[PDB]
């Protein structure tokens, strides 16, 4: 199933993360999610836990061979579509015009689901250049597209 092209990318990334926790041929089980994110997949935290991800640095460490199957197991995780995202945000849109207030945007991002930190929230709003208007409203559809299409 896994293209050799893909196995190569996994090695490259694996070695980067190996280096970054102390070169020794193993990546911390806590960084499992991030390796995979670098490879272009978007697992929920609950996914990476199901494949062996730990809650904290220093509990377990994986050599490449134990890591490959973790990756293969997340690779098929469910990923949100744009339609799903719009439906979700629409439940917070009070008049269905396409706006949501910035405070609400922050409530859903750091108060629901797998809650993101204030720092993480401020950063995605920064990177996506999402501005609110004079009454504190933002268009969730722009934000959704910017996040989906990625940093490049």
């Amino acid at each position: 199933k896994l293209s050799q092209d893909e196995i190569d990318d996994l090695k490259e990334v694996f070695e980067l993360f190996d280096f970054w926790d102390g070169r020794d041929g193993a990546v911390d089980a806590f960084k499992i999610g991030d390796v995979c994110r670098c490879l272009g997949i978007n697992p929920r935290n609950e996914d990476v836990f199901a494949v062996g991800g730990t809650h904290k640095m220093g509990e377990k460490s994986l050599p490449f061979e134990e890591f490959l199957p973790a990756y293969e197991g997340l690779m098929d995780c469910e990923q949100g579509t744009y339609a799903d995202y719009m439906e979700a945000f629409k439940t917070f849109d009070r008049e269905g015009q396409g706006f949501i207030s910035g405070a609400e945007l922050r409530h859903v991002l750091s108060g629901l689901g797998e809650r993101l930190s204030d720092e993480e929230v401020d950063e995605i709003i920064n990177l996506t250049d999402l501005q609110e208007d004079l009454e504190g409203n933002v268009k969730y559809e722009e934000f959704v597209k910017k996040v989906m299409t990625g940093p490049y």
């Binding site: 280096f19 970054w20 926790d21 102390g22 070169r23």
Partner: protein, 141 residues
């Protein structure tokens, strides 16, 4: 390894020390070079330096003596930009806790003894590691 610009540097260094234009560095070249720079070592220290070469000190011998010790070294600029990598706002400093962490717990970890000798004489003030000054120190004793 080992890069041309570094080979060109070793060659230029060999050439200046070889005051005779011998093609060999001998004890006279060394006394001459040392005396041009400051205190000149006694003839014992000089001969001991020369005995590190298992033969007449020509350029290929000079290479034997320096190649391994220099092979992985980088210019002052390269090293300052390596530090710059962790200095986003270009303050020309690093938090002492930050650089200690990088060195000790990431990459090719520094053991407790490497950390001790690294920070014995490092220029650190108010929690700030002066990496520009630090680079100067590791390039010039």
């Amino acid at each position: 390894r080992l890069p041309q610009k570094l080979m060109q540097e070793m060659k230029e260094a060999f050439t200046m020390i070889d005051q005779n234009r011998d093609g060999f560095i001998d004890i006279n070249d060394l006394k001459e070079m040392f005396s041009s720079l400051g205190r000149t070592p006694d003839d014992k220290e000089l001969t001991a330096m020369l005995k590190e070469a298992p033969g007449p000190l020509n350029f290929t011998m000079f290479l034997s003596i320096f190649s391994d010790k220099l092979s992985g070294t980088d210019s002052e600029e390269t090293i300052r930009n390596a530090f710059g990598m962790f200095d986003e706002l270009d303050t020309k400093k690093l938090n002492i806790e930050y650089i200690k962490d990088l060195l000790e717990n990431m990459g090719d970890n520094f053991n407790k003894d490497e950390m001790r000798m690294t920070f014995k004489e490092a220029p650190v003030e108010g929690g700030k590691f002066d990496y520009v000054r630090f680079v100067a120190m590791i390039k010039g004793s």
